[PDB]
Structure 1
């Protein structure tokens, strides 16, 4: 009923990424992060900035042509944390409350058949 695209939300710690693209992926449209919509470096990942970034994203989305979208939220992944960051659910909340539509949302965090030694060495990051 609507026009569909991809939301794709990389929500790590220390920042949260949102950017809508073509459903094929190649051509992307409107981005902006949390590190953008406030300056404080340490406040780069708080749900507040994430919301404000979902605001800017929704604004251009409904300014170019996308009326709907599917989200693929995503943590750092790889050999790192693997657990969803602070400002993705808030970005989700803010982009649904925007006025855009929503349909089907799977997670795409890279999970390995494990390996490549994790950083920080055997004795652990100790502090």
Structure 2
């Protein structure tokens, strides 16, 4: 049969934890899963790996596929619960989550997955540095 690799410990009452990082830009979306120490990468699915048109590299659809794609890979890691660290290029950019955000989570919950605690880790700065554009910014 299958040769799983999740630690040698099962139990339909023993929860496994995986920290899922999700960055949702207005261009691309990321979905990452890693040890609760976040120093060893496991699963990594981005909208780009999911569609052809660069404009769709964001999409709600790309979030579904990249999301469900990870859950499958996760049942094999023997992990059922996921901690969520949600972000969105905080830096000096629209500190607002993208679109493929509420879409990704939703997909993980539906396709089974148990959800641990949920954080928002969009890096808000104390100061700032001259943003996109300048003085007047995107005009038109």
Name the residue aligned to 1:2.
15
Which structure 1 residue ranges, 4+ long, deviate > 3 Å from structure 2? none
Matched, 1:76 2:86: no
Establish whether residue 63 from structure 1 lines up as the match of residue 76 from structure 2: yes
| 1:1-127 mapped onto 2 (5 Å cutoff) | 1-127=14-140
TM-score by length of 2: 0.87
Query: How many Å apart are 1:65 and its aligned residue?
Result: 2.2
Q: Distance in 2 between matches of 1:114 and 1:86?
A: 27
Q: Work out the CA distance in 2 between the residues paired with 1:125 and 1:49.
A: 27
Q: Select the structure of larger CA radius of gyration.
A: 2
1:111, 1:46 → 2: CA distance? 25
Give the 3-state SS of the residue equivalent to 2:119 in structure 1.
coil
SS of alignment partner, residue 88 of structure 1: helix
Aligned length: 127
Q: Which residues of structure 1 form unaligned runs of 5+?
A: none
DSSP-derived class of the 2:63 partner: helix
